[PDB]
Amino acid sequence: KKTITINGVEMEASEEQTVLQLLNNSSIEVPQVCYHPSLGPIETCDTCIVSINGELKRSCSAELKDGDVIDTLSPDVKKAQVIGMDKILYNHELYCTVCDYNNGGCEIHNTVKEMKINHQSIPFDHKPYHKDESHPFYRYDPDQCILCGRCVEACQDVQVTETLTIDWERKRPRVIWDNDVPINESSCVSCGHCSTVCPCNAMMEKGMEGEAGYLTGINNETLRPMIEITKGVETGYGSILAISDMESAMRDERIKKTKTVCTYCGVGCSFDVWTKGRDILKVEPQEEAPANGISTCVKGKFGWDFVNSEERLTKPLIREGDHFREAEWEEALLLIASKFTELKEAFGPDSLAFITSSKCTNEESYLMQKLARGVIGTNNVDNCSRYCQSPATAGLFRTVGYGGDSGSITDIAQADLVLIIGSNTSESHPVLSTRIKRAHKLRGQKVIVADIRKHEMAERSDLFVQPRAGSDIVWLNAIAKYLIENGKADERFLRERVNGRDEYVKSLAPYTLEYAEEKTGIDQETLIQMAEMIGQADSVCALWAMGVTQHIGGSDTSTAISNLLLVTGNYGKPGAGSYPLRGHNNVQGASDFGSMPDRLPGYEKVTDEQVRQKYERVWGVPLPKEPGMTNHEMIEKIHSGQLKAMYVKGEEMGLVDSNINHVHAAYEKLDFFVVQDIFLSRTAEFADVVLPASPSLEKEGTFTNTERRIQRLYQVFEPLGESKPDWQIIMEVANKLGAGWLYEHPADIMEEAAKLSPIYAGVTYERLEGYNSLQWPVNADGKDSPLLFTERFPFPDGKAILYPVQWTEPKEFGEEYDIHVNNGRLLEHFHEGNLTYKSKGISEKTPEVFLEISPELAAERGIQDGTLVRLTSPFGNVKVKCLITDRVKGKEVYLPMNDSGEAAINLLTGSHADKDTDTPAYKETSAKMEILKHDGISPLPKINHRNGNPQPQIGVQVHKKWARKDYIFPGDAVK
């Protein structure tokens, strides 16, 4: 279809919608300043004017009709592009020679060069507005703004926060925030999209200002006259632009760009890191990034100031009475080896626990389990996935077969219906939500939200239900019951790929529509309209998180979600599946490499005689037959005099494991404690030997994100002082016992594991070069799997097994503890703040921990904002400050876990856990309300990403610009 003629040359189309898309593929030069591929056409620069069938139109927005005659070289088309560029340079001073955006990628600078323009007809004019340095991470230079609206199109349709707008009604239209409110005071989420998508220095990250070049260091008081003198003398742009290109070229000497995978959430955002020595100038996302492209949250683009903190540990520590004395590497490595062997030949290998981190790479987890199993001889291996992804894994293993997402993030945005169950996705997996919100806004995507808090995802949704605590499984079974009775369920799928229909049908018997209304608190009217839409949609993506996982029957509710998709045929279909949102950056990756004490790498259980020999052949030590203990149950082993030593790397489990009053007492009850964190954390205080680890940027390796995407890291900087990387430390520790491991770099560790792992059979560092990534199960040759179970399931018959599960009564505190206390994440604060609060800008929007109370709740209890309150539980007590917020309901407060101290929600959490995979029940906690104060410093200020008011709109409203009588189209100006 479609045959065209480019300047006489006959041509044919493949799939391109626009003329510009064709001219770009055909390598034909055409200016296109405001066109960004990820943003779509905006029609704000008018630099792409071409003659299609005699008509002068913008090629970025030009439907590819049949038999069109494109003209990209006529004196009239070039003369028109020129007129457009002169109106661009009217709002640009252009000082590349001394500008930080002169790095060979400034769309304006590179286009002036391309257009062969040396004298602008419309001289530059200063805009009557001021620069807004209010935000601690980026600035706005109005005098350099070209009203391209790339930032506006990104904030509204990409990030879908809707803060950025352009007031076209003004004499000088400028980029406004809310109602022309300063950025710090506005509803700015601080993602950094606006700066990523701006083509010039108008929207720029403050970390580059006076740091990028050599002449950029000059103070503005002397640099401004320097510029005026330059303009007066210069002849044509061609000459001075060439000089600027030389400074830009010299910039390669001092600036380094290294690809990395974000160590915040499990989204798996890949991006370059522009560093000059130890300082970071900018996080530059690259279009080809697999899980995000040019998308970031606040943390990924600006939360890296922790690597350069004074609290960082450089030299290893050893306990010396009332203090930690600095000690040499070899003398510390000998001490740990001395005690480990002493305890091994006195109590047994089982007396040594080995806790891995969900921050460490795939190799780091593999070597930590190799040290415990192939050196020490015990199976005591676990990460923070006991309380995080245990129901997320167990729920899927019991029904479909693999402990991971059914597809990639792209499948979520394509899906007709997105079901969200217990997930604050906006403030936990942010880049993921900018796909859900994007599709709900642009494609009219069906979104159903189901959790006790009305968060950003809930308000931007088509349907929002509020079930009671531990009652999600009830309505899940009720929907399935309704769907199967009314013949709405996909029966073809049930016969073809489902094993055990009639058995599961009998288990749905007590789940009548009226039963769900009595237990959950969801009216049968909305309860039936959500069930009708689940079966009406072509593809359903079920996204669940801690509001499902951290419960008494956490695994039961997880299994209920998967077979509900199974019942409606939402598997092996492009745009549907089960998506347990992995919270940690490498919680999936660590799990994949035998970090479960129940399984070896590649999810193969430690009970196979054959797999126990497959690993023994290449290790040379008899693999332990005794199954290990989970992170949760080994805490009790200490009090019973069974656990002697523990090796926890990069995890603050003495702050994130259920009941920290008990796990603090359990920590001081063991003989040896070796902690491997980058900072001196709460867990690190109770240690005997501390080993200073090297963070994400100070090492290379691999990270398997939520969509089972194994990405590769590039070392940004080499270890600070003597802080060896985590993998190096593990190797040296194993060697000091007697292992003799030889890995020149982390790539060598991967090739040892990849052979042994069946799913990771064909994973090579060469296949992960640059922004390349693989999705397991990946064949030995290199065939990955973006979507799971396309032709068969991982079971003998190739069918999925339904799991009948009954609603286990949620263990509630009751009697005196009536006001339930919730727990979760913030957008800017990644837990306690041992990485985020270090970035001092993140501490301005959110400075402290708070207790979210509703206007209904703050009336019956007689409380205001900025007041001290005491929430007491049968496990602990907290000294939190009350925050009045419109999100929560009834008598259900919210305590986000962003304080490693006295106001931590881990004191109040109970020892009670899930009835299948030892998952601590955090979303099952209640407390009593006491008052300590009436007035004080408010926990959340006006300068936050939630206090402001957004102004939603689609696109940039380019017609408002075109409405102005000063605007004249370049094409009809020549006419």
Partner 1 sequence: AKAIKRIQKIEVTEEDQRKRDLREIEDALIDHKEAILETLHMLGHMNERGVLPLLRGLFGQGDKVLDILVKKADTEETANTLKNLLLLFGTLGMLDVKQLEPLILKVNA
Question: Whose Cβ is closer to ligand MGD: residue 2's or residue 946's?
Answer: 946
Q: Which of residues 379-398 bind ligand MGD (CB under 6 A)?
A: 384, 387-388
Type of residue found at 447: V
Cα-based distances in Å from 692 to 50, 334, 654, 713: 60, 16, 18, 20
Among positions 99, 372, 419, 450, the unique one binding ligand MGD when judged by CB under 6 A:
450
Task: Please tell me whether residue 380 binds ligand FES under the rule CB under 6 A.
Answer: no
Task: Please tell me whether residue 203 binds ligand SF4 under the rule CB under 6 A.
Answer: yes
Pull the structure tokens for residue 14: 């493949």
Phi/psi of residue 334, each to 5°? -80, -40
> What count of residues does the chain have?
975
CA distance 610 to 626: 16
Task: Please tell me whether residue 931 binds partner 1 under the rule CB under 8 A.
Answer: no
Q: Which of residues 730-759 bind partner 1 (CB under 8 A)?
A: none
Quick one: DSSP state of residue 351? G
Do 383 and 631 contact (CB within 8 A), yes or no?
yes
**Which one of Mo ion, ligand FES, ligand SF4, none is in contact with 388 (Cβ closer than 5 to 8 A by kind)?**
Mo ion
Question: Whose Cβ is closer to ligand FES: residue 44's or residue 156's?
Answer: 44
831-845 exposure pattern, b = at least 16 Cβ within 10 A, e = fewer:
bbbbbbbbbebbbbb
The minimum distance between CB 147 and ligand FES, in angstroms, equals 11
Phi/psi of residue 917, each to 5°? -125, 35
Nearest by Cα to 600 from 796, 397, 362, 591 = 591
Task: Please tell me whether residue 943 binds ligand SF4 under the rule CB under 6 A.
Answer: no
541 marked among binding-site residues: no
What end-to-end distance do the CA atoms of the chain give, in Å? 32
CA distance 449 to 440: 13
Task: Please tell me whether residue 263 binds ligand MGD under the rule CB under 6 A.
Answer: yes
CA distance 630 to 619: 24
Among positions 452, 484, 590, 884, the unique one binding ligand MGD when judged by CB under 6 A:
452
H helices present in 90-159, as ranges = 107-114, 150-157
The region of 34-42, 182-190, 266-274, 905-913 touching ligand FES under the rule CB under 6 A is 34-42
Task: Please tell me whether residue 824 binds Mo ion under the rule CB under 5 A.
Answer: no
Task: Please tell me whether residue 150 binds ligand SF4 under the rule CB under 6 A.
Answer: yes
Among positions 237, 771, 830, 875, the unique one binding ligand MGD when judged by CB under 6 A:
830
Phi-psi label, residue 120: left if phi above 0, alpha if psi -120 to 50, beta otherwise: beta
Do 768 and 751 contact (CB within 8 A), yes or no?
no
Pull the structure tokens for residue 6: 């480019």
Compute CA 797 distance to the chain's CA centroid, rounded to the nearest angstrom: 36
Task: Please tell me whether residue 367 binds ligand FES under the rule CB under 6 A.
Answer: no
The minimum distance between CB 731 and ligand MGD, in angstroms, equals 14
Do 419 and 540 contact (CB within 8 A), yes or no?
yes
198 marked among binding-site residues: yes
The region of 38-46, 102-110, 415-423, 689-697 touching ligand FES under the rule CB under 6 A is 38-46
388 marked among binding-site residues: no
148 marked among binding-site residues: yes
CA distance 28 to 7: 11
CA distance 426 to 402: 26
Question: Whose Cβ is closer to partner 1: residue 641's or residue 798's?
Answer: 641
Half-sphere exposure of 663 (CA within 13 A, CB side): 24
CB atoms within 10 A of CB 221: 7
Task: Please tell me whether residue 556 binds ligand MGD under the rule CB under 6 A.
Answer: no
User: x/- binding map, residues 660-689, to partner 1, per CB under 8 A?
Assistant: ----x--xxxxxxx------x----xxxx-
191 marked among binding-site residues: yes
Q: What are 319's strand-pairing partners? A: 324
Do 386 and 917 contact (CB within 8 A), yes or no?
yes
Task: Please tell me whether residue 546 binds ligand MGD under the rule CB under 6 A.
Answer: yes
Question: Whose Cβ is closer to ligand SF4: residue 231's or residue 325's?
Answer: 231
Angle between the 746-756 and 609-619 helix axes, to the nearest 10 degrees? 150
Q: Which of residues 250-289 bind partner 1 (CB under 8 A)?
A: 250, 252
Do 644 and 669 contact (CB within 8 A), yes or no?
no
CA distance 793 to 184: 51
Cα-based distances in Å from 965 to 90, 171, 525, 625: 17, 11, 53, 82
Q: Which of residues 75-94 bind ligand SF4 (CB under 6 A)?
A: 92, 94
Reduce the DSSP state of residue 827 to 3 states and report it: coil
Task: Please tell me whether residue 467 binds ligand MGD under the rule CB under 6 A.
Answer: yes
Among positions 41, 136, 149, 395, the unique one binding ligand SF4 when judged by CB under 6 A:
149
**Which one of ligand MGD, ligand FES, Mo ion, none is in contact with 831 (Cβ closer than 5 to 8 A by kind)?**
ligand MGD
The minimum distance between CB 962 and ligand FES, in angstroms, equals 11
CB atoms within 10 A of CB 179: 11
CA distance 643 to 406: 38
- For residue 856, what are the contacts with CB-CB under 8 A and spacing of at least 6? 889, 890
Do 97 and 240 contact (CB within 8 A), yes or no?
yes
Q: Which of residues 242-301 bind ligand SF4 (CB under 6 A)?
A: 262, 264-265, 267, 269, 292, 296-297, 299-300
CA distance 12 to 66: 9
User: x/- binding map, residues 210-229, to Mo ion, per CB under 5 A?
Assistant: --------------------
CA distance 313 to 82: 57
- Residue 777, preceding peptide bond in cis (omega within 30° of 0): yes
Total residues in contact with partner 1, by rule CB under 8 A: 44
Q: Which of residues 215-244 bind partner 1 (CB under 8 A)?
A: 218-219, 221-222, 225-226, 228-229, 231-235, 238-239, 242
Total residues in contact with ligand SF4, by rule CB under 6 A: 48
Assign 3-state DSSP to the chain and report helix, strand, coil percentages, each to 5. 30, 15, 50
Task: Please tell me whether residue 34 binds ligand FES under the rule CB under 6 A.
Answer: yes
**Which one of partner 1, ligand FES, Mo ion, none is in contact with 48 (Cβ closer than 5 to 8 A by kind)?**
ligand FES
Q: Which of residues 342-361 bind ligand MGD (CB under 6 A)?
A: 357-360
Question: Whose Cβ is closer to Mo ion: residue 281's or residue 388's?
Answer: 388
Task: Please tell me whether residue 601 binds Mo ion under the rule CB under 5 A.
Answer: no
The region of 594-602, 651-659, 748-756, 839-847 touching ligand MGD under the rule CB under 6 A is 651-659
The minimum distance between CB 232 and partner 1, in angstroms, equals 3
269 marked among binding-site residues: yes
Question: Whose Cβ is closer to ligand FES: residue 147's or residue 720's?
Answer: 147
Over the Cα atoms of the chain, what is R_g? 30
Q: Is 609 exposed, middle or buried (0-12, 13-18, 19+ CB in 10 A)?
A: exposed
Binding residues (CB under 6 A) for ligand SF4: these are: 92, 94-96, 99, 101-102, 106, 108-109, 145-151, 154-155, 159, 161, 163-164, 175, 188-194, 198, 200-203, 262, 264-265, 267, 269, 292, 296-297, 299-300, 430-431
Binding residues (CB under 6 A) for ligand FES: these are: 32-35, 41, 43-48, 58, 60
> Which residues are annotated binding-site positions for [2Fe-2S] cluster?
34, 45, 48, 60
Binding residues (CB under 8 A) for partner 1: these are: 218-219, 221-222, 225-226, 228-229, 231-235, 238-239, 242, 245-246, 249-250, 252, 315, 317, 319-320, 322-327, 664, 667-673, 680, 685-688
Binding residues (CB under 6 A) for ligand MGD: these are: 263, 265, 357-360, 384, 387-388, 421-425, 427-428, 450-453, 455, 467, 469-470, 472, 545-547, 550, 583-584, 649-652, 656, 676-679, 681, 693, 695-696, 726, 822-827, 830-832, 834-835, 897, 905-906, 909, 922-923
